[PDB]
Design a protein around this nucleic acid. Structure first.
Lengths: 269, 159, 52, 169
RNA sequence: AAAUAUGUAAGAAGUCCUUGUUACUUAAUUGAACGUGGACAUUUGAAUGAAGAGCUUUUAGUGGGCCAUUUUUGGUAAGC
RNA sequence: GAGAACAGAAAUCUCCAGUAGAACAAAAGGGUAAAAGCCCCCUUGAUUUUGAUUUUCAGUGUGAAUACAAACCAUGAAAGU
RNA sequence: GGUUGCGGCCAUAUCUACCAGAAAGCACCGUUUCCCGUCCGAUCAACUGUAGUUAAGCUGGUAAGAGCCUGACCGAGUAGUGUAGUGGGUGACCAUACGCGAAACUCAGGUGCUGCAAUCU
């Protein structure tokens, strides 16, 4: 283009060129009642990569946002889940995990257990009386398009079940009937565990077996059937409730050799 | 006939600066405003809710109330032969703090410190500021800079 | 017609004086939610400093 | 050469400008749910002109976008109507092309004398794997110039395929 | 992007520390506002001046204006 | 701008560029780009009680706006509006 | 040092053209049974990380580049301007005295910095 165009061109913000952030959303999620002066406003960031899930609890300051807790889906093998990590059940578990982690970091994991017997209802964390109120976080689903059945509400359900107060409605969980405005808890409980994957496992074991062996390869390599998922996820929920803490990864090197290896590659000036 | 509106004679006042158009950045929605704070009013025409009047642009005032998304400020307006307290509610987008007072505050944080220092030190230290006093004696050397004589230059051949 | 000549000399004979700020300004224009609780706070402080 | 560089077919759009709304327009749309299989989509007008005799927000014409294997089959059976003799003018600088036929029945479809005789407009678009980055929502971005489709790439692809015998005029 | 002109501040109704009230607020024994009780209280935190500061009532006349500098608008231009 | 039968300077379809050169009932000005615009969905905050404030200003009215409170409602996954 | 998520300042960060990217990551990519939305599983939705790839995106590099930022014995103490004079001049307008004092330009340099958490041979 010409020179005047490039002069009179105003750029957008960096995270709007990069296409990662909605400021029309951030302005509403972050700003607080001025009468609540320094009171932070905690967001529950849920993000989905092609082979991971990131749950984060984030407050905001002027020196960038700040994290309180984190829960990725590439650590669930601690608790049992190994396959199907970008999955509705994985999202549920990850939400439960960030919940159970945050609440013991604070001191409320014994006061707000949430739910432990899961049957798939719309149930909010009700505040105990003469006691601390629940931890209140607000969901911010990036640029993820909201659709009933989406994964991102898996984590929402998991968190509200895990103990902390995420205000929501049940019209975007799977098993919601548009014509009658009615929810199907049997279907939702089937989705919390692997129901919608187990039926496909069973339906391909009589329809397309080469494709079954192609997709569900690791399951057979680890000797898994379509019935053990409802055992695995429930055995993992209890484990998360047991030890939700963050024991980090033992590092091979010490962030100095990691830089010594990369410093020879980056084509320095 | 002539017009006296709420936004008359505001062509250049409430317009955005060059290459500063668009959304309001977030650092202003995260700044915190307490009663007693001192704020300078500068509006933006991106946000027509909570606008001040063109009189109060560039003025400076004191907060007296804090509400959701907006604060109240007191401003002394000259009308006739007296000043009047004008209490006006504004969204935060038309508000920035005043560093005028903050400089005084850190000057106090310094004078207290060196007063505390000098007391235990048994010395006296002057904390009243002073203007630019006159200069003082000095001696100017002529070693590398001999006085370079000049002259008024002529006009012919300059034109 | 609308000559401002002499009006500022008129304004400046009896000065232009400031509005005499006071301590404890009025609590009419403030958030009533705050005001309602302020009343109770001060009443309790009184009933406590009376006892001690 | 390499994978992830091949000029696969993205989609094929069929257009039919009927010009006027009515049973003619429904005749036009009736062929498409049997040719492609998908229902069509009618296209409202945009302005008001009387040389052609239309006004705004009239459903004057129709189209349909077909993808997948069926697109390449339809293209194969549509090219034999042109005898696989395309020009270089029809090819566009973006790396895509199309052609307009006069008779619709020369493709393999059953004939009726009541439906009418109306032509069609084929237009393909073909792009390498990796153009999602212009269409997605999060982290949009343009492809690199070493990865864009060009006229000289697609005419080469078309000479290779189908035994074109293009008319470089 | 000037010059001139313009808003605010330059401390005692202040600064620091501690812990009391509330039906507001907080995930909360979190803050907000008001406080108690202690510390600084010398140069009380720029200059010049202050011919006293603040407040209140009540009431007269006036509500035809002109000249000059400078800027400036219609007007050819004026003691327009 | 490059292209596609009838198709033309102009009917419909496709790609690239495009900081707004468009549109936002209506005057001009300001403002606005995952919107304040274009399409679609649900709705009636165009509601109740009465007050404080800004503007014209005598700090009176009328008119129009601003920000909260106590209620009831909508919308949305929610923040929020 | 590299990458991801959330971000702050929002061009030193943009635009144009060529090159390199080990590790992991991200991404591209594969599949439509279900939830879901499409003229079309293209976008969006869901499933698997399984079959393949760094080609692009992304990051880092380079350039008589445009653009942007920064600073000047640059322009320039210029233009303009406040105050004064029984100063000049027919007037336009000008000079002087006490003061304030630019800009476009010209020159030189630069071409994203950084915060929280996690992770990487």
């Amino acid at each position: 283009k010409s020179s005047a165009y490039s002069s009179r061109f105003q750029t957008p913000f960096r995270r709007r060129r990069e296409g990662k952030t909605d400021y029309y959303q951030r302005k509403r999620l972050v700003t607080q009642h001025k009468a609540k002066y320094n009171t932070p406003k905690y967001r529950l960031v849920v993000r989905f990569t092609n082979k991971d899930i990131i749950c984060q609890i984030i407050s905001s300051t002027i020196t960038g946002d700040v994290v309180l807790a984190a829960a990725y889906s590439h650590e669930l093998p601690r608790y049992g889940i190994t396959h199907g990590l970008t999955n509705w059940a994985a999202a549920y578990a990850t939400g439960l995990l960030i919940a159970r982690r945050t609440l013991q970091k604070l001191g409320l994991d014994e006061t707000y257990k949430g739910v432990e017997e899961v049957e798939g209802e719309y149930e909010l964390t009700e505040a105990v009386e003469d006691g601390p109120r629940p931890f209140k976080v607000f969901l911010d689903i990036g640029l993820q398009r909201t659709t009933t059945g989406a994964r991102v509400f898996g984590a929402l359900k998991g968190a509200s079940d895990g103990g902390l107060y995420v205000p929501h409605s049940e019209n975007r969980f799977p098993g919601w009937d548009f014509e009658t405005e009615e929810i199907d808890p049997e279907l939702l409980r089937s989705y919390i565990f692997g129901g919608h994957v187990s039926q496909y496992m069973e339906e391909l074991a009589d329809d397309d077996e080469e494709r079954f062996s192609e997709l569900f390869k690791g399951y057979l390599a680890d000797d898994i059937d379509a019935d053990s998922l409802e055992d695995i996820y429930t055995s993992a929920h209890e484990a998360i409730r047991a030890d939700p803490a963050f024991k980090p990864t033992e590092k091979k090197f010490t962030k100095e050799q990691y830089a010594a290896e990369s410093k020879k590659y980056r084509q320095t000036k | 006939g002539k017009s006296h509106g709420y936004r008359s004679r505001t062509r250049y006042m409430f317009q955005r600066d060059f290459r500063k158009h668009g959304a309001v950045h977030l650092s202003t929605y995260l700044k915190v405003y307490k009663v007693g704070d001192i704020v300078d009013i500068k509006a933006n025409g991106s946000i027509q809710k909570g606008m001040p009047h063109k009189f109060y642009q560039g003025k400076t005032g004191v907060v007296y109330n804090v509400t959701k998304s907006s604060v109240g400020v007191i401003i002394n307006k000259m009308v006739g032969n007296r000043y009047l307290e004008k209490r006006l509610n504004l969204r935060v987008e038309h508000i920035k703090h005043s560093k005028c007072r903050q400089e005084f505050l850190e000057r106090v944080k310094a004078n207290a410190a060196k007063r505390a220092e000098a007391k235990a030190q048994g010395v006296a230290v002057q904390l009243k500021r002073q203007p630019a006093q006159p200069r003082e004696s000095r001696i100017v050397s002529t070693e590398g800079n001999v006085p370079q004589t000049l002259a008024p230059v002529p006009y012919e051949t300059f034109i | 017609n609308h000559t401002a000549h002499n009006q500022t000399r008129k304004a400046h004979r009896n000065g232009i004086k400031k509005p005499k700020t006071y301590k404890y300004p009025s609590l009419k224009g403030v958030d009533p939610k705050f005001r309602r609780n302020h009343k109770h706070a001060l009443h309790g402080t009184a009933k406590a400093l009376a006892a001690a | 050469q390499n994978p992830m560089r091949d000029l696969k077919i993205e989609k094929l759009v069929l257009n039919i400008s009927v010009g006027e709304s009515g049973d003619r327009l429904t005749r036009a749309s009736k062929v498409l749910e049997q040719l492609s299989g998908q229902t069509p989509v009618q296209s409202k007008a945009r302005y008001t002109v009387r040389t052609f005799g239309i006004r705004r927000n009239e459903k004057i014409a129709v189209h349909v976008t077909v993808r997948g294997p069926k697109a390449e089959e339809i293209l194969e059976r549509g090219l034999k109507v042109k005898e696989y003799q395309l020009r270089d003018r029809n090819f566009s600088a973006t790396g895509n092309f199309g052609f307009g036929i006069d008779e619709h029945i020369d493709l393999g479809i059953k004939y009726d004398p009541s439906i009418g005789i109306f032509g069609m407009d084929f237009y393909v678009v073909m792009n390498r794997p990796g153009a999602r980055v212009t269409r997605r929502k999060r982290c949009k971005g343009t492809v690199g110039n070493s990865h864009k489709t060009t006229k000289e790439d697609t005419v080469s692809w078309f000479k290779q395929k189908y035994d074109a015998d293009v008319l470089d005029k």
